[PDB]
Amino acid sequence: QRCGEQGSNMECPNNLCCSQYGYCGMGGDYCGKGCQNGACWTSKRCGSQAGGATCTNNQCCSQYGYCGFGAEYCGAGCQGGPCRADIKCGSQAGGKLCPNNLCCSQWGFCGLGSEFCGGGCQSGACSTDKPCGKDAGGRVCTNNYCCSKWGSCGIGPGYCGAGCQSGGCDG
Amino acid sequence: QRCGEQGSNMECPNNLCCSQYGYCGMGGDYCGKGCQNGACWTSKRCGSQAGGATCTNNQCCSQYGYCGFGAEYCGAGCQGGPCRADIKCGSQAGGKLCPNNLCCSQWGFCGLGSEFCGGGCQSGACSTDKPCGKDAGGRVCTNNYCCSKWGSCGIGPGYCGAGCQSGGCDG
Numbered sequence: 001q002r003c004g005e006q007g008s009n010m011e012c013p014n015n016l017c018c019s020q021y022g023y024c025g026m027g028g029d030y031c032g033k034g035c036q037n038g039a040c041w042t043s044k045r046c047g048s049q050a051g052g053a054t055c056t057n058n059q060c061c062s063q064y065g066y067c068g069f070g071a072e073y074c075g076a077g078c079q080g081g082p083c084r085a086d087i088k089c090g091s092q093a094g095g096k097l098c099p100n101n102l103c104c105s106q107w108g109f110c111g112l113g114s115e116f117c118g119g120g121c122q123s124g125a126c127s128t129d130k131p132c133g134k135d136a137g138g139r140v141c142t143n144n145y146c147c148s149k150w151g152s153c154g155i156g157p158g159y160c161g162a163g164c165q166s167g168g169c170d171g
Numbered sequence: 172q173r174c175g176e177q178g179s180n181m182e183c184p185n186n187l188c189c190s191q192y193g194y195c196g197m198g199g200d201y202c203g204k205g206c207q208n209g210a211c212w213t214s215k216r217c218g219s220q221a222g223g224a225t226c227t228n229n230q231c232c233s234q235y236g237y238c239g240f241g242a243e244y245c246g247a248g249c250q251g252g253p254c255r256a257d258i259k260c261g262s263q264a265g266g267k268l269c270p271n272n273l274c275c276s277q278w279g280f281c282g283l284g285s286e287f288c289g290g291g292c293q294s295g296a297c298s299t300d301k302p303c304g305k306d307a308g309g310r311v312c313t314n315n316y317c318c319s320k321w322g323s324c325g326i327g328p329g330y331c332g333a334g335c336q337s338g339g340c341d342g
């Protein structure tokens with residue numbers, strides 16, 4: 001029930017702003033100074049301009065390296081987020097990984113839903129629960145996900161914990 | 172450090188999925204059944220098709236009323252989220268309110284950043300801290316925000332609590 005650093009980076013809903021304290025609301029108290037996510041009065045820096053950084057709340061990183069929504073951010077030159085132009089990926093775009101766990105469709109585009117996450121899904125939050133492990137002819141997940149002791153790709157204690165065969169195994 | 176119903180609707184970061192229990196991770200345990208937000212294997216229903224409902228994680232509500240990202244969702248017929256076409260608002264579009272607290276620019280478009288939230292901002296997470304109250308010639312905030320005892324628009328205990336002049340005052 002806590003956001004930002006004090007909520008393991010949880011994010012408020014409806015772009016509610018997360019104050020410097022880890023509470024959600026709207027207004028200067030939250031959106032003003034120390035804001036850590038949501039609709040912070042001061043756009044956070046992103047993209048090139050800010051060491052490869054991604055925006056929170058699924059924001060489009062404008063060409064200038066500022067986070068937001070609207071033509072200016074999502075529009076031309078956009079560098080991350082639900083960018084107005086199809087973000088490419090997969091074996092089509094040299095192994096490229098969708099940002100923010102998005103699915104790399106069979107076709108080489110980034111998204112979320114059956115069309116992207118479904119059959120053919122190359123990387124990201126594929127819903128095709130494909131197997132890994134000794135169990136899966138020594139195949140490692142994508143996104144450096146954890147191959148749990150049952151040969152399943154995911155992120156968490158059950159996945160990254162004990163019996164973790166490969167991926168980002170808690171060490 | 173808890174999501175969904177057990178985290179006052181906090182949302183995991185990077186589209187991490189929130190399990191039926193209120194924990195964040197990636198995989199079937201979280202993305203499978205009971206998923207409450209993030210990249211849930213099963214798209215949540217939205218728009219018309221689902222009583223005016225908005226998608227979580229700033230997702231585009233496709234023409235069919237399913238939440239996601241990518242051309243299919245964000246593209247033509249899109250009904251909410253960082254839709255690929257400019258969502259209109261403000262006095263230009265009959266008082267329309269941007270969804271998900273987005274700013275209604277001076278021009279009548281929805282977004283987030285200086286360009287939308289800045290000078291002229293009509294409604295939403297305007298960063299122009301305009302005043303309300305007896306203090307402000309009996310002017311009420313937009314979005315049914317709370318006019319605190321100091322004549323400030325916001326959402327929270329300090330705003331919606333005691334001394335709340337108008338808005339969604341905790342009652």
Ligand SMILES: CC(=O)N[C@H]1[C@H]([C@H](O)[C@H](O)CO)O[C@@](O[C@H]2[C@@H](O)[C@@H](CO)O[C@@H](O[C@H]3[C@H](O)[C@@H](O)[C@H](O)O[C@@H]3CO)[C@@H]2O)(C(=O)O)C[C@@H]1O
Binds near residue numbers: 043067072073286
């Ligand atoms: C769409 C987008 O990214 N909007 C940004 C813009 C853009 O970066 C910009 O419009 C592209 O030209 O900038 C905003 O921040 C700028 C603003 O604070 C202005 C002054 O108010 O300065 C810009 O940078 C200056 C900086 O202030 C100086 O200290 C420095 O000496 O020069 C810099 C030259 O760029 C800020 O980037 C804006 O409000 O216009 C923020 C939007 O999110």
Ligand SMILES: CC(=O)N[C@H]1[C@H]([C@H](O)[C@H](O)CO)O[C@@](O[C@H]2[C@@H](O)[C@@H](CO)O[C@@H](O[C@H]3[C@H](O)[C@@H](O)[C@H](O)O[C@@H]3CO)[C@@H]2O)(C(=O)O)C[C@@H]1O
Binds near residue numbers: 113114115233236
């Ligand atoms: C972009 C988008 O919204 N993608 C959805 C699609 C679309 O709703 C669709 O492609 C537009 O035609 O549908 C997805 O769900 C559908 C899928 O489960 C199929 C069958 O696997 O059925 C569709 O609805 C059926 C429903 O299953 C039947 O019980 C009912 O008798 O008829 C319905 C007629 O539409 C689902 O909508 C999909 O996976 O294709 C989900 C995507 O998010």
